[PDB]
């Protein structure tokens, strides 16, 4: 099987805007995660062909990655911050679903998730 197309990062039918919370998600949250030592597996869509994972997209039907989130934020694709937060959570949950508790990649995802929640909490009122 080929890889599926990546998640859309623009959509001419979907209203878009820029908000302070969305700017924070790009300039602080995504920036912080992107530079983390464990970011690399999450910086692009899972290439199931290259990784020899013929069953990845049989199991994961809602793929998401930080490369896609980054482009979405840069493109002002979202209407609200909870949409973007959901994309991060989808990415983490996918990792937990495909893999098993305690796996190397699961620990990496858990570390990133902890940091993500810290940065979200730090959003100034
Ligand atoms: C760019 O994408 C990758 C590069 C390489 C790689 O060959 N690399 C890593 C970078 C480079 N490093 C050199 C040393 N420096 C310090 C860091 C970079 C050495 C060369 C390997 C895998 C990559 N992609 C990837 N993307 C998502 C994954 C994943 N892999 N894994 C792997 C289990 C652990 C990761 C999985 C394996 C099986 C089933 C599921 C997953 C999974 O859930 N996720 C999230």
Domain residue spans of the chain = 19-123
User: How was it solved?
Assistant: X-ray
Exposed (0-12), middle (13-18) or buried (19+): which is 94, by Cβ within 10 Å? buried
Resolution (A): 1.7
The tokens describing 11, both together, are 């959509």
Distance CA 6, CA 91 (A): 13
Phi, psi of 41 (to 5 degrees): -70, -15
Mutate to test the pocket of ligand 1, among 38, 40, 110 (most ligand atoms within 8 A of CB): 40
- Cβ density class 49-87: b for 16+ within 10 Å, e for less: eeeeeeebeeebeebbbbbbbbebbeeebbeebeebbeb
The tokens describing 91, both together, are 């990415």
Asked whether 105 lines ligand 1 (CB < 6 A), one says: yes
CATH entry, 19-123, from 2.60.120.10, 1.20.920.10, 3.40.50.720, 1.10.3470.10: 1.20.920.10
Asked whether 53 lines ligand 1 (CB < 6 A), one says: yes
Asked whether 98 lines ligand 1 (CB < 6 A), one says: yes
Residues 6 or more apart whose CB falls under 8 angstroms from that of 108 comprise 38, 41
The tokens describing 104, both together, are 């190397």
- Angle between helix 81-98 and helix 66-74 axes, rounded to 10 deg: 170
């Amino acid at each position: 099987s080929m890889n599926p197309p990546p998640p859309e990062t623009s959509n001419p039918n979907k209203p878009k805007r820029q908000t302070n919370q969305l700017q924070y998600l790009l300039r602080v949250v995504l920036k912080t995660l992107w530079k983390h030592q464990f970011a690399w597996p999450f910086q692009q869509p899972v290439d199931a062909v290259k990784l020899n994972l013929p069953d990845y997209y049989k199991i994961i039907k809602t793929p998401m990655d930080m490369g896609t989130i980054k482009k979405r934020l840069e493109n002002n694709y979202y209407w609200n911050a909870q949409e973007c937060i959901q994309d991060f959570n989808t990415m983490f949950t996918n990792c937990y679903i495909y893999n098993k508790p305690g796996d190397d990649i699961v620990l990496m995802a858990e570390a990133l998730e902890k940091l993500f929640l810290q940065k979200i909490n730090e959003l100034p009122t």
